[model samples]
Every structure is written in C-alpha cells, then in structure tokens.
Target: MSSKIFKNCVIYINGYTKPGRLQLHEMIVLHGGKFLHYLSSKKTVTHIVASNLPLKKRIEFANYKVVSPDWIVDSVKEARLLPWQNYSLTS
Candidate 1:
C-alpha cells in the first residue's frame, strides 16, 4: 500500500470559482497539494497525500506564502485522512 503525510490544510478557494471537483484539484495543487496525491473529495472538501514534511513545506513555498500569500485554507477535518476512503480521477 502507498503511504502519505499531510499537515492541516483547508478546502476553499477565492474569486469567481466555488469549490468543486476540478476546483478542488486546482486548489489542492495551488496550496501545496501536488507534492501529494489527489486523494479524494466530497462536495467542496478535497484531500491530498504528501510524502514528507520537507516536501510539504516546499509545496507551500512554491504555491503560497512568498508566491501567493493571500491564499486560504479551509479545513475538511482536524487532520487529513489516510488510506483515502476511496479514489477517483481528476484533471
């Protein structure tokens, strides 16, 4: 089985778009999600599986803070779930 790690993050977006499947992918990728796997989603909530803490920090650096400091984090849960409950494809 594949294993992943993620810090506390949110599932939200700004501007004209509301959270959805595609939007979730974009948001997750935007806010340090791509370093991780696109785990799953439900309504506006999305989950990502990152490899480690250093990578997680790198992802945030690439997308948020210095690059886009105005971003937001809308939490789905206290901690990101593991084993993903299920999987689905995203573009």
Candidate 2:
C-alpha cells in the first residue's frame, strides 16, 4: 500500500467546491494553475487520474493535493519524450 497528501487551501469565486474540488470550472483553470504547481513541486507526490486537466489542475493549484503513487508504473508503458521547446524550470 501507499500514501498520499491533501490540503484545503484554495479559494473559490463561486464560494463552492467539492471534497477535493476548488473554485468553479472557470476559475479553476486560472487559480488552479498555482495549485497544481505547488503539488508538482513536491517530490513525494505523483500519478494523477483526472477526469480532465481543469479538474486535475484545480487540485494541483491548491498546493496540497497530490497525484497517486502509481504514476511511475503508468509511465513505464509510454515512449521516451523530448523537450518541446527551450523552457526554464525556475522562471
């Protein structure tokens, strides 16, 4: 078995969110970006099974949500990828 982490640290414009969902779908994409970055920055978290990017992004922007640990296993079936363009990790 494995473990995961989560936190309730997001604000919504509509003033409503689900057990893990934060902000409305519209605001999620915007604010959620911040949330996702926080989670991804953490080394302990990985593997996200999102219904879609917006839904997943919303969780990520919160700085407390994490993808499942099975992400590494899932990636094993994929092919090698390359950098799309020049980008900075710390921008």
Candidate 3:
C-alpha cells in the first residue's frame, strides 16, 4: 500500500453488501483506508460500499457517497481512488 493511495479514507460496509464483507475490508485495509463495523457515526464514513440499497437506506446515505463494490476492486487495480461518480447508486 502506497501510504497515500487510500490514506485518510474511512469506509463503511452495509450488512448486505456484495463481494463479501471480509473481501471489502481486506481491500480497504490493504490500500490504506479505515473500515467501521457499523454505521453508528455519520462523520466517520467517507464512503459506503454496497451493490444495492433499500429505499430507506438510500435516503439515509443521500448525503454520503454510496458506491459499488467494484469501486474497491477497480481502485486496488488502478492503485488509486477513482471518481465516486462512476460508481454511484441510482434511485
């Protein structure tokens, strides 16, 4: 991990997130990011990784960046965080 690639980034995983929770955590940790077991505090989350979200949850994360699991894989492969816009969750 290049110290600054995913440095300072804080990620949160939904209980039903795709790609498995362990895989997501490994990717984030290996790339210098932090992961919280739950979404207790909003400020702690810089991004939310999930493949799908319920309408209610989607609204809750409206202010936060909700991205796909592919974002993690792609970021690791590219060695950097790509634009979240490309991985945004649609309504």
Q: Could you give candidate 1's per-residue lDDT for residues 5-91 as a string of tens digits?
A: 233444323222334346545545543444223223423344332212243454454432111211222233323433332321111
**Candidate 3: lDDT of 35?**
84
Kindly report which residue stretches of model 2 are placed more than 4 angstroms away from their true locations once superposed. 1-61, 80-91
Order the numbered candidates by TM-score, best leading.
3, 1, 2
lDDT of 3 by residue, 1-91 (tens): 4544678688887636766888888877777778888787775557887777675767766655578777777777777878877876645
Q: Residue-wise lDDT of candidate 2 within 1-91, one digit each (tens)?
A: 2211122222112122222344222222432222342233444432222322344455555432322212222322232212212211111
lDDT of model 3, residue 61: 64
TM-score of 1: 0.23
Q: Which stretch of 10 consecutive residues in model 1 shows the poorest summed lDDT?
A: 65-74
TM-score of every model? 0.23, 0.19, 0.78
Q: List the residue pairs that clash in candidate 3.
A: none
Q: In candidate 1, which residue ranges exceed 4 Å CA deviation?
A: 1-18, 35-73, 76-91
> How high is the lDDT of residue 84 in model 1?
36
User: Each prediction's Cα lDDT score?
Assistant: 0.33, 0.28, 0.73
Error of 1 at 27 (Å): 0.5
Residue 62 Cα positional deviation in candidate 2, in Å, after optimal superposition? 2.9
Any runs in candidate 3 off by more than 4 Å, and if so which? Answer: 1-4, 60-63
